Amino acid sequence: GFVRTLRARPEAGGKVPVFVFHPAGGSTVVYEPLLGRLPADTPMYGFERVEGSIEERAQQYVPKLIEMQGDGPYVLVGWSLGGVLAYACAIGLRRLGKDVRFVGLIDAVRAGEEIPQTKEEIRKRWDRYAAFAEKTFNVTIPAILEELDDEGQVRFVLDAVSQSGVQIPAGIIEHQRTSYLDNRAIDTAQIQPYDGHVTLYMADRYHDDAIMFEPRYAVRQPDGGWGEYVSDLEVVPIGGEHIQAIDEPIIAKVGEHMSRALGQIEADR
Numbered sequence: 001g002f003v004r005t006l007r008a009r010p011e012a013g014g015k016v017p018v019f020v021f022h023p024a025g026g027s028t029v030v031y032e033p034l035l036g037r038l039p040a041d042t043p044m045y046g047f048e049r050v051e052g053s054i055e056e057r058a059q060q061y062v063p064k065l066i067e068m069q070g071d072g073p074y075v076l077v078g079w080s081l082g083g084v085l086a087y088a089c090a091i092g093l094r095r096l097g098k099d100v101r102f103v104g105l106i107d108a109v110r111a112g113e114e115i116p117q118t119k120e121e122i123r124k125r126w127d128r129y130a131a132f133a134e135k136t137f138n139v140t141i142p143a144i145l146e147e148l149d150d151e152g153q154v155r156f157v158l159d160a161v162s163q164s165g166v167q168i169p170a171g172i173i174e175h176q177r178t179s180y181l182d183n184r185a186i187d188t189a190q191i192q193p194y195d196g197h198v199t200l201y202m203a204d205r206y207h208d209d210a211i212m213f214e215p216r217y218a219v220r221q222p223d224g225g226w227g228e229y230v231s232d233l234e235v236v237p238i239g240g241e242h243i244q245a246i247d248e249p250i251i252a253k254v255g256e257h258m259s260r261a262l263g264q265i266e267a268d269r
């Protein structure tokens, strides 16, 4: 399946499980530091990669979420891509009349300026990713005319790396491939409004490689773009860079706040 047990719930009773969603190019094992900062015996299950648009991924996740937790309450948490997935699941659960009590977005932040949706921006986008690959693997990707699938675009870059002579591990290449595709899913997402409570854990800025990939991550709005879609939004400053938000020491601030939120939920069952 696509569900990873990070801490199993007791056979009966116990606390409300926390559902976490994978980041681009990684597994839900990244949430182990967070789990360390949550109360003892807090169950946590991780939702791993599935294919399609954000909406289509949520369509696969939501039935499984319901199978596991039923009417609720639902606690949905995600860093980076995982935050977008958690949000989409929040929409789906809410449409099915489920009790969603917490949505935790760990620095899942929209580009601070409008991204052009033109033919020319497709070329520029690709060029930036190629430049990222070049620096990452110290190789020269040849010039790419390129009207083909997202899969085909990343494959051109990664095929160029392997054919260059250099020997990158297969796992590193594969994570690079899925990372690219997941980020494409983010940018083609059609984000819907949500009337529930959303907690945005807000870092200071995006890391350099994110900005290299998409320049408009250089700027971010105070609300991370979510205010438009969420009338009940709580922004919690955590400082640091996007990439550091998931680890110690920054994750302590997330876990402290989240622990109090979970405490309140337990008092209403």
Ligand SMILES: COCC1(CN(C)C(=O)c2ccc(CCn3cc(-c4ccc(-c5cc(OC)ccc5OC)nc4)nn3)cc2)CC1
Pocket: 024, 025, 079, 080, 081, 083, 084, 107, 108, 109, 110, 111, 132, 179, 180, 183, 186, 187, 188, 189, 190, 191, 209, 210, 211, 213, 224, 225, 226, 229
């Ligand atoms: C792992 O990737 C490796 C890769 C790229 N690279 C080298 C990186 O370093 C890299 C780049 C980017 C990211 C993603 C960070 N992120 C963005 C968001 C987000 C949330 C929401 C909306 C959003 C979007 C909307 O429609 C477009 C509308 C509203 C909306 O929000 C209110 N947009 C965006 N969440 N996390 C992570 C790492 C080589 C591939």
